[PDB]
Structure 1
Amino acid sequence: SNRLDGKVAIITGGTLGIGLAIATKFVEEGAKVMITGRHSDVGEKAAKSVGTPDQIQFFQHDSSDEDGWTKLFDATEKAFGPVSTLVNNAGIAVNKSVEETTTAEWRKLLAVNLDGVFFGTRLGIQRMKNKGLGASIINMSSIRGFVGDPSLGAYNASKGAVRIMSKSAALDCALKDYDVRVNTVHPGYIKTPLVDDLPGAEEAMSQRTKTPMGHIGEPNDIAYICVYLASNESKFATGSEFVVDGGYTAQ
Structure 2
Amino acid sequence: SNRLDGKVAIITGGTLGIGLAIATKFVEEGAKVMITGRHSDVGEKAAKSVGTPDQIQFFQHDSSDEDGWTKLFDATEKAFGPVSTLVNNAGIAVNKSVEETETAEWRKLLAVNLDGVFFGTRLGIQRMKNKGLGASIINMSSIEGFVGDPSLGAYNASKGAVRIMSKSAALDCALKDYDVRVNTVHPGYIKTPLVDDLPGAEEAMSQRTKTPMGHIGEPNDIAYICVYLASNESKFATGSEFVVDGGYTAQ
Equivalent residue number for residue 43 of structure 2: 43
Shift of residue 10 of structure 1?
Answer: 0.1
Q: Secondary structure at the match of 1:121?
A: helix
Equivalent residue number for residue 233 of structure 1: 233
Once residues 199 and 134 of structure 1 are traced to their aligned partners in structure 2, the CA distance between those partners, rounded to angstroms, is 43
Q: Secondary structure at the match of 1:163?
A: helix
Shift of residue 77 of structure 1?
Answer: 0.3
Between 188-197 and 144-153, report the one with greater CA deviation: 188-197
Shift of residue 248 of structure 1?
Answer: 0.2
Shift of residue 197 of structure 1?
Answer: 1.1
Equivalent residue number for residue 161 of structure 2: 161
Q: Secondary structure at the match of 2:183?
A: strand
Shift of residue 243 of structure 1?
Answer: 0.1
Shift of residue 193 of structure 1?
Answer: 1.8
Q: Secondary structure at the match of 2:113?
A: helix
Shift of residue 192 of structure 1?
Answer: 1.2
Can you give the 5+ residue segments of structure 1 that lack an aligned partner in the other structure?
Answer: none
Normalised TM-score (structure 2): 1.00
Q: Secondary structure at the match of 1:117?
A: helix
Q: Secondary structure at the match of 2:130?
A: coil
Shift of residue 144 of structure 1?
Answer: 0.1
Q: Secondary structure at the match of 2:25?
A: helix
Shift of residue 185 of structure 1?
Answer: 0.1
Once residues 66 and 31 of structure 1 are traced to their aligned partners in structure 2, the CA distance between those partners, rounded to angstroms, is 25
Shift of residue 249 of structure 1?
Answer: 0.1
Once residues 142 and 46 of structure 1 are traced to their aligned partners in structure 2, the CA distance between those partners, rounded to angstroms, is 24
User: 1:18-69 deviations in whole A, cap 9, x for unaligned?
Assistant: 0000000000000000000000110000000010000000000000000000
Q: Secondary structure at the match of 2:104?
A: helix
Once residues 198 and 241 of structure 1 are traced to their aligned partners in structure 2, the CA distance between those partners, rounded to angstroms, is 29
User: 1:75-114 deviations in whole A, cap 9, x for unaligned?
Assistant: 0000000000000000000000000000000000000000
Once residues 90 and 82 of structure 2 are traced to their aligned partners in structure 1, the CA distance between those partners, rounded to angstroms, is 22
Equivalent residue number for residue 144 of structure 2: 144
Once residues 196 and 120 of structure 1 are traced to their aligned partners in structure 2, the CA distance between those partners, rounded to angstroms, is 30
Q: Secondary structure at the match of 1:210?
A: coil
Equivalent residue number for residue 205 of structure 1: 205
Between 191-200 and 163-172, report the one with greater CA deviation: 191-200
Q: Percent identity among equivalent residues?
A: 99
Equivalent residue number for residue 30 of structure 2: 30
User: 1:208-230 deviations in whole A, cap 9, x for unaligned?
Assistant: 00000000000000000000000
Shift of residue 194 of structure 1?
Answer: 1.3
Once residues 93 and 155 of structure 1 are traced to their aligned partners in structure 2, the CA distance between those partners, rounded to angstroms, is 6
User: 1:113-154 deviations in whole A, cap 9, x for unaligned?
Assistant: 000000000000000000000000000010000000000000
Aligned-residue Cα RMSD (Å) equals 0.3
Once residues 166 and 81 of structure 1 are traced to their aligned partners in structure 2, the CA distance between those partners, rounded to angstroms, is 25
